[PDB]
Ligand SMILES: CC(C)(O)c1ccnc(-c2cccc3cc([C@H](NS(=O)(=O)C4CC4)c4c(Cl)cnc(N)c4F)sc23)c1
């Protein structure tokens with residue numbers, strides 16, 4: 152019948168109580184799983200929220216059991232990291248015609264950008280020509296934009312790759328897809344494997360290859376899984392590498408911007424930084440140089456979450472201000488301001504947020520008097536402003552801005568990073584009662600910019616902002632257990648997550664879940680056989696433009712009613728969330 156092949160590969164909903172015994176749980180990609188830790192994330196008070204996420208973040212460094220999946224510290228993973236370091240050296244010693252591309256969609260693209268710059272800086276601080284570049288799906292504007300649709304073409308990945316790679320004779324392509332999912336990266340990897348004379352592909356994500364996506368990609372013939380499997384075969388002869396430790400589920404299910412993005416920086420900062428440090432010394436990069444770096448990042452989690460109490464407070468404030476229809480400002484310097492901007496933008500697609508709700512500023516790129524003349528005017532009693540900087544920053548700029556903002560609102564807070572024994576100028580201190588200062592131990596360091604200190608700081612801020620933005624929205628009641636039910640379907644991945652979420656919460660067959668989702672999407676059009684057989688992109692393109700699709704679908708299924716009926720009931724409920732929970736009892 153129509154739609155049987157489109158949906159053939161969706162696993163059937165199990166019968167009640169047998170989610171485990173059917174083998175269904177074992178098939179959920181680690182990156183899509185419900186993290187047992189956060190099953191009641193929707194009931195946790197702010198303090199618990201910080202704790203539960205700091206703990207989800209911790210799983211990044213948790214060791215492999217004695218049967219189960221390789222992790223970061225597993226010997227097979229570290230070996231792979233060393234051999235890739237190795238290949239990145241060959242290219243470092245031959246910089247004419249050599250290039251290193253970091254590539255992904257969404258937050259994977261954003262991570263790739265930050266790291267391309269950092270390592271380009273390093274090469275320059277040492278007077279050598281920069282060999283790094285990045286690619287992000289949808290081009291360079293995607294870096295600071297919510298543009299979830301752009302990851303779904305393999306040809307557009309290959310195109311961007313052929314662009315930045317022309318003329319070059321040795322290119323290392325680091326494709327980053329947390330879920331081993333993005334067609335944008337899959338095409339790059341396959342192109343690489345078709346021309347190894349020039350290309351060395353390296354795939355980075357956090358599922359076993361047996362859980363890589365196996366869906367048809369609409370402009371292409373292999374699936375991400377086949378690609379990743381061909382890469383794996385090639386690794387024995389060292390012409391492709393798959394670097395894919397399990398780090399455990401996200402605290403918020405499928406929100407791969409969180410642990411996935413952090414583990415991405417962790418994993419590649421470590422490996423690339425080792426690669427540089429050790430070319431100098433004329434030594435093979437070793438499992439032990441990586442280890443040093445890895446353990447440092449691991450201390451960095453402990454140091455960051457030492458400050459948990461004031462992380463929770465900042466959260467409580469961010470939430471209150473969102474709850475009163477107010478807005479949130481994340482102001483910060485150099486690289487930390489970027490991260491601030493990446494985080495606010497990600498709340499748009501993650502939580503259904505207006506871009507003003509949580510937004511970031513680099514000193515988007517609106518600097519001193521400009522910020523004070525444009526943004527400063529229109530503030531309010533109820534708004535929250537966060538200042539994010541290090542004690543190596545233009546602290547004059549800082550205190551100026553804090554001052555004027557002080558008058559507009561009281562809900563300021565700061566995130567301040569120091570080397571131990573640095574101190575706050577006291578006009579800055581008195582301006583923040585409960586300041587969040589993270590003081591870093593002294594560490595020995597090879598290079599001028601002290602890159603290992605940037606990496607620590609960037610990561611620690613990422614964790615703080617991710618945890619704040621995410622738990623603020625959970626406090627508002629927007630999250631259902633540990634799932635974001637009411638997401639906007641803007642790509643094929645998100646279509647499949649919507650469907651799976653409808654199987655999970657309704658408990659009903661796949662045939663019905665699919666029907667109810669396609670009806671909610673395409674309403675007022677009825678389900679014809681064309682619609683049933685359409686490619687997934689046609690569903691996406693229509694769902695992208697609507698509201699509450701997935702809750703309308705769930706209601707229809709829970710009441711056994713039409714879309715007309717479920718819509719009227721959702722309109723008669725106090726809120727989306729109230730209606731859904733209600734129906735679920
Ligand atoms: C936990 C919950 C709600 O049950 C859930 C959430 C999301 N996905 C699943 C799930 C369960 C079983 C298999 C698959 C397969 C998934 C899906 N693969 S697919 O697109 O080729 C196929 C069309 C579904 C997928 C997706 Cl959507 C993202 N990443 C990976 N690696 C992945 F395999 S998600 C998923 C389960």
Ligand SMILES: O=P(O)(O)OC[C@@H](O)[C@@H](O)[C@H](O)[C@@H](O)CO
Pocket residue numbers: 255256257258259299302327328329330331332333405406407408409411497500501
């Ligand atoms: O890295 P992946 O698995 O290919 O995911 C790439 C993008 O879908 C993903 O980063 C998305 O933008 C984030 O909002 C997830 O929280």
